[PDB]
Design a protein around this ligand. Sequence first.
Ligand SMILES: [Fe+3]
Ligand SMILES: [Fe+3]
Ligand SMILES: [Fe+3]
Ligand SMILES: [Fe+3]
Ligand SMILES: [Fe+3]
Ligand SMILES: [Fe+3]
Lengths: 190, 190
Amino acid sequence: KSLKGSRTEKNILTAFAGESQARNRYNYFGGQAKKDGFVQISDIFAETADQEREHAKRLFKFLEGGDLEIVAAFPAGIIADTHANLIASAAGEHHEYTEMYPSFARIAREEGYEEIARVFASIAVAEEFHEKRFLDFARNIKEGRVFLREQATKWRCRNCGYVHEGTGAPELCPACAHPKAHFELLGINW
Amino acid sequence: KSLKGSRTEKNILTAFAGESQARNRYNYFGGQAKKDGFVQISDIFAETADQEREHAKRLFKFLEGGDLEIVAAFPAGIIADTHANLIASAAGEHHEYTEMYPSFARIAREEGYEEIARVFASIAVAEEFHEKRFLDFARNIKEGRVFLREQATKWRCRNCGYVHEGTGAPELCPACAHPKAHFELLGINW
Ligand SMILES: [Fe+3]
Ligand SMILES: [Fe+3]
Ligand SMILES: [Fe+3]
Ligand SMILES: [Fe+3]
Ligand SMILES: [Fe+3]
Ligand SMILES: [Fe+3]
């Protein structure tokens, strides 16, 4: 059935507006992470922004045209240090998966928009992992564990692929001469 | 000391020529992986190409100008299916870390170019992991394990971040509606 005049129609636009802003915020935080010397985290922010772009696209495609007025609150700023940005980002993700999406999904179901409700619920799952990443990285920064660990492990240079074995990433990559900022724990997800 | 007239000078240019070609090949293979429905693998090819760009840059910066003639053999083609491309790529990486770089490093040491020799050796380490990734992915394709595993696990949509729990990736992402091609095993390297 058509969405015209429904609460779900406005909820979709509200979600689209929020996700659009989140995309920008995450890209800015990504740039700041770069300046703060956290390349992996910078790329994580950039990827999250791209994924918010996709959540927004799915939502946008449900709309059927025309200008619609919405009333909603959003983060008025700001760009701080990377740890602070990760904390604020996690809080935003938390709101989305614990409050916004579940509420929007329930209303969608109430109004008879099952497919849309399922999409809202599905997006919430992605947001929960987004929060996890942001919280995990914030914790690594706070504990001084971004580039140094208790036991020896493997570190990979994101710039050239060099693999370093040790308790911590080197000050300079011996292969490409790029700074420690480019290193991450070697990951294998396959 | 200057590199002029040394064998190391020509070895550096030879490595630069090969790495430059590898960058192109990997980008083309990345495009083919996309067409074959392997997004994670496509992005892996693209990242490897970018890293070859960086190995090449480090090498390029050692040179001191002028045109230099080199005699070397390179892969004359070709672009095939993704499994075949992964196999050929791994073979190329194998040559680089087992033959080319170690030989170039030894000669560099022999001619008194210690720093350059260390860089050759360091690049070799990155290439060995490049081969590992290519071989692991080729094996996943051959065994039909790219999108399906024996026990239930977590799969992540690279397009939107949705997380799916099950023995295999879904045909369609319930959040962004993108095809199975976008899924990968959920990874946590932090
Ligand atoms: Fe979001
Ligand atoms: Fe999110
Ligand atoms: Fe490096
Ligand atoms: Fe290479
Ligand atoms: Fe390589
Ligand atoms: Fe998705």
